[PDB]
Amino acid sequence: SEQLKHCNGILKELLSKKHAAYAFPFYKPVDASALGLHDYHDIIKHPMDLSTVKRKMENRDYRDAQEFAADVRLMFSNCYKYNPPDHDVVAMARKLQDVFEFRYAKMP
Numbered sequence: 001s002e003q004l005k006h007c008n009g010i011l012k013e014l015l016s017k018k019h020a021a022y023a024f025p026f027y028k029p030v031d032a033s034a035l036g037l038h039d040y041h042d043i044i045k046h047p048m049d050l051s052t053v054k055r056k057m058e059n060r061d062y063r064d065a066q067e068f069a070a071d072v073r074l075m076f077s078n079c080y081k082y083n084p085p086d087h088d089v090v091a092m093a094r095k096l097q098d099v100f101e102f103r104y105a106k107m108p
């Protein structure tokens with residue numbers, strides 16, 4: 001749909017080199033074992049990341065823009081839940097979420 005094309009455009013922007021300096025933590029699922037975050041999956045019940053959003057978009061999983069937005073927002077919320085608010089990753093999440101929200105608001 002037209003709205004899903006807008007969402008795909010947003011997705012491509014979030015993955016683009018333009019935003020890589022602060023988007024990179026969100027590219028792939030959090031590897032909790034790798035990062036030593038042995039409480040991550042006790043605190044975060046529904047992990048989400050941009051590669052998962054991209055797979056869902058490619059597989060036509062999302063039926064509308066609202067479903068797409070809920071997953072992107074879940075990704076950011078997981079970051080805000082797990083990490084203290086002064087953490088560098090939280091600053092990065094806030095910056096990427098600003099990119100997302102401002103462009104999502106321009107939905108046709």
Ligand SMILES: COC(=O)C[C@@H]1N=C(c2cccc3[nH]ccc23)c2cc(OC)ccc2-n2c(C)nnc21
Binds near residue numbers: 082088089
């Ligand atoms: C040691 O990891 C952490 O304290 C949490 C982790 N931080 C980071 C993180 C991201 C950016 C700067 C950072 N400084 C210390 C940790 C950290 C992180 C890094 C990644 O690299 C592939 C992927 C995911 C995360 N991430 C997300 C998303 N949510 N929390 C994290």
